[PDB]
Amino acid sequence: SPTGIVLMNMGGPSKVEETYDFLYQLFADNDLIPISAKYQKTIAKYIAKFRTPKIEKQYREIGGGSPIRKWSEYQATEVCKILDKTCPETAPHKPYVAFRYAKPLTAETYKQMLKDGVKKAVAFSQYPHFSYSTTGSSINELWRQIKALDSERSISWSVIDRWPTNEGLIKAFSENITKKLQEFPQPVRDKVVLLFSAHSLPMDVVNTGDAYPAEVAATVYNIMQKLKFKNPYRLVWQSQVGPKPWLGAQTAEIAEFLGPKVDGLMFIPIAFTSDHIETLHEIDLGVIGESEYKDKFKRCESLNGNQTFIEGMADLVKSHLQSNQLYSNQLPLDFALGKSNDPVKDLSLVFGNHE
Amino acid sequence: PTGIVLMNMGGPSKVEETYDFLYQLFADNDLIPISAKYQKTIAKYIAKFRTPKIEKQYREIGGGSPIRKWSEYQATEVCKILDKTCPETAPHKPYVAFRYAKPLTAETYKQMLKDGVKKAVAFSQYPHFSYSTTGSSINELWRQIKALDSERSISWSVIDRWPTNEGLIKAFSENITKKLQEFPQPVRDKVVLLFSAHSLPMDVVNTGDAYPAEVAATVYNIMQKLKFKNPYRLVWQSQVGPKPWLGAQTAEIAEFLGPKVDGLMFIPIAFTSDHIETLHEIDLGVIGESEYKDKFKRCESLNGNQTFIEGMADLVKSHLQSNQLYSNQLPLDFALGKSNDPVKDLSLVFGNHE
Ligand SMILES: [Co+2]
Ligand SMILES: [Co+2]
Numbered sequence: 282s283p284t285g286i287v288l289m290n291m292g293g294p295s296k297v298e299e300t301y302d303f304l305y306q307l308f309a310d311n312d313l314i315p316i317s318a319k320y321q322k323t324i325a326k327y328i329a330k331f332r333t334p335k336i337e338k339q340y341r342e343i344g345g346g347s348p349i350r351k352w353s354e355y356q357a358t359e360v361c362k363i364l365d366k367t368c369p370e371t372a373p374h375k376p377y378v379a380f381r382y383a384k385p386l387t388a389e390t391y392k393q394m395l396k397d398g399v400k401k402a403v404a405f406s407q408y409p410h411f412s413y414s415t416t417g418s419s420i421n422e423l424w425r426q427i428k429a430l431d432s433e434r435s436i437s438w439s440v441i442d443r444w445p446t447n448e449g450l451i452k453a454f455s456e457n458i459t460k461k462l463q464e465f466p467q468p469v470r471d472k473v474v475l476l477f478s479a480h481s482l483p484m485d486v487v488n489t490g491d492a493y494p495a496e497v498a499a500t501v502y503n504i505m506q507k508l509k510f511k512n513p514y515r516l517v518w519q520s521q522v523g524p525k526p527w528l529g530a531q532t533a534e535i536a537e538f539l540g541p542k543v544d545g546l547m548f549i550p551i552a553f554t555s556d557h558i559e560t561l562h563e564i565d566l567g568v569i570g571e572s573e574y575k576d577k578f579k580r581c582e583s584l585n586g587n588q589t590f591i592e593g594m595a596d597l598v599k600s601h602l603q604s605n606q607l608y609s610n611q612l613p614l615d616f617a618l619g620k621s622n623d624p625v626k627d628l629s630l631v632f633g634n635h636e
Numbered sequence: 637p638t639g640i641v642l643m644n645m646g647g648p649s650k651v652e653e654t655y656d657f658l659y660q661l662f663a664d665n666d667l668i669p670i671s672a673k674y675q676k677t678i679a680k681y682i683a684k685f686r687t688p689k690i691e692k693q694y695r696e697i698g699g700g701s702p703i704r705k706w707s708e709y710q711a712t713e714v715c716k717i718l719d720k721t722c723p724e725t726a727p728h729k730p731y732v733a734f735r736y737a738k739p740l741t742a743e744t745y746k747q748m749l750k751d752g753v754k755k756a757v758a759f760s761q762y763p764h765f766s767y768s769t770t771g772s773s774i775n776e777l778w779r780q781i782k783a784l785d786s787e788r789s790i791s792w793s794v795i796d797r798w799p800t801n802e803g804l805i806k807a808f809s810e811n812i813t814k815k816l817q818e819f820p821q822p823v824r825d826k827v828v829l830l831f832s833a834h835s836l837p838m839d840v841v842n843t844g845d846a847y848p849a850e851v852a853a854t855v856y857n858i859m860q861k862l863k864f865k866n867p868y869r870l871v872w873q874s875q876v877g878p879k880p881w882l883g884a885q886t887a888e889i890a891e892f893l894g895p896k897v898d899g900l901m902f903i904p905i906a907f908t909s910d911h912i913e914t915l916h917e918i919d920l921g922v923i924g925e926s927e928y929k930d931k932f933k934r935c936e937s938l939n940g941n942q943t944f945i946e947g948m949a950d951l952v953k954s955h956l957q958s959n960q961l962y963s964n965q966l967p968l969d970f971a972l973g974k975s976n977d978p979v980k981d982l983s984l985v986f987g988n989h990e
């Protein structure tokens with residue numbers, strides 16, 4: 282009986298047409314978005330069609346589609362082959378990806394899992410940095426899908442809610458960064474500023490006591506220790522949108538500011554593990570693309586298929602499996618500080634064997 | 637002939653050095669950007685207005701700030717070590733230069749010239765760099781070097797950060813561990829460890845200030861040493877005025893959690909000694925004013941901790957034993973900081989220039 286290793290993460294439209302459904306899924310979540318209730322399957326779509334055009338154009342601009350799913354199913358498949366020679370008592374490990382908004386959503390995957398006769402499953406969240414708005418929404422969803430497609434639970438779930446300083450992760454980022462630094466002049470290679478750029482969070486989420494901001498920061502300091510603080514660095518945030526206040530030190534804003542007085546700037550996808558709208562469009566076409574400093578701005582390659590990084594994940598899942606912990610010591614606290622309309626009341630009820 | 641000048645904001649030594657302190661404090665546009673054009677003016681207005689309450693706080697904790705004493709004690713103690721550890725740099729005289737508190741950089745730079753100091757190290761007692769603090773502190777030293785020592789007698793070098801100094805981490809660790817012993821065993825691994833650090837105006841945060849992330853580095857390191865035994869969270873205290881400030885307020889997080897936890901510990905993660913903030917904000921306010929005074933406890937401040945002091949002495953050793961009159965991060969710090977009177981060339985401020 283196969284052990285399910287399910288990679289999770291918010292998701293992105295495989296191909297341009299997928300935008301509508303992707304945007305619909307998004308705009309129908311109270312984990313954050315409305316209030317309402319069925320006066321909002323309505324209001325939801327009144328927002329989806331509105332927004333579809335813009336987004337399709339962005340994806341069209343990046344080859345047409347988010348590479349997330351491609352890369353995810355890949356990472357998931359490699360980490361399972363390794364887990365096969367590595368963790369034999371959990372013998373067959375099958376690759377599964379369950380995205381929060383993109384396809385396959387949690388329910389679709391859950392269905393496929395059961396019809397594959399899955400006993401044990403590991404909700405392996407692809408966000409090394411836990412945020413109730415990311416790794417949290419997947420859990421609150423997983424809960425519902427469990428209750429929906431599997432009451433009297435045939436599946437026993439455990440979850441890897443965070444891995445900010447996993448060795449593979451840190452080594453992978455270094456290397457990729459030195460590798461990218463090397464393609465800089467030299468008489469100025471040590472003066473290139475490393476801008477670690479993570480997706481930002483709204484202040485009324487940060488102030489909530491979210492664990493995201495500080496964890497990202499731990500990863501950053503770890504990579505710098507590895508590189509023996511050779512270059513100047515700084516943790517900045519991107520992707521903020523709307524009128525509300527967002528976690529400060531905006532990537533674009535600081536890029537343009539330093540653009541003149543610096544002779545080198547490197548952006549690093551610190552908070553995500555593959556390319557997606559954020560790197561390909563926001564940074565490559567935005568921050569770098571439209572800047573008059575295009576030349577002294579380069580982006581560190583996303584982890585993607587990086588082997589060292591894959592092995593890191595395998596190491597992770599293996600440690601998680603053999604530790605018998607259903608979730609990190611931090612999750613209960615997160616859930617007590619998080620904010621949702623349909624939360625998880627007891628984490629110990631969601632995860633574990635409930636025969 | 638070698639001065640080790642510890643530096644931090646400082647605190648009123650006597651219940652009334654307050655208005656002077658608060659004035660000096662808010663007159664600094666580098667700490668809290670209130671008015672680029674009328675900070676000083678708006679300053680004494682705020683000073684004279686907040687002096688009552690604050691003066692009463694300094695009296696609910698003994699009538700003064702212990703910062704000066706603790707600073708001086710650490711300074712000399714760290715210096716006693718350096719004499720046996722770095723004979724290579726003859727006598728090490730302990731100095732203290734407060735930004736807004738009594739021994740101001742002014743007073744202190746004078747002494748050092750009278751005592752004939754050739755070389756000195758500006759030792760920021762703020763493990764985590766921020767422009768509002770270390771920067772302000774430095775931007776002043778520059779002004780002092782310019783008015784008091786145009787000859788360029790003293791050779792300065794700065795310790796602008798030390799987020800993960802071994803002694804620091806280990807100290808905080810031991811101190812957190814023993815305090816958890818005060819909680820009943822059956823709950824010990826359940827106590828949430830709130831690392832409370834002085835908040836920052838969002839205005840400073842969005843400039844690219846290195847502080848928030850550096851505090852984060854210390855906290856994490858501390859949790860590894862503790863093998864993530866308990867739940868933890870980095871929260872923020874201290875703020876003022878309508879202006880928005882960082883993270884989750886310690887006060888609020890505390891009040892919200894009281895009902896959901898077995899216990900809460902507060903850790904002065906961002907400072908090196910007790911002062912108004914631990915002794916009052918936390919002890920009297922957060923802890924002693926909560927109907928949970930029992931399930932709430934405060935981790936001991938480093939103060940005169942030997943593990944801590946030895947790390948500082950050992951830190952100074954490393955520093956001296958090298959070039960770098962400042963770290964690799966400072967320049968960027970100065971590119972991102974915001975001041976009406978910044979240091980144009982860090983390269984000119986720290987060196988031999990004679
Ligand atoms: Co976004
Ligand atoms: Co303060």
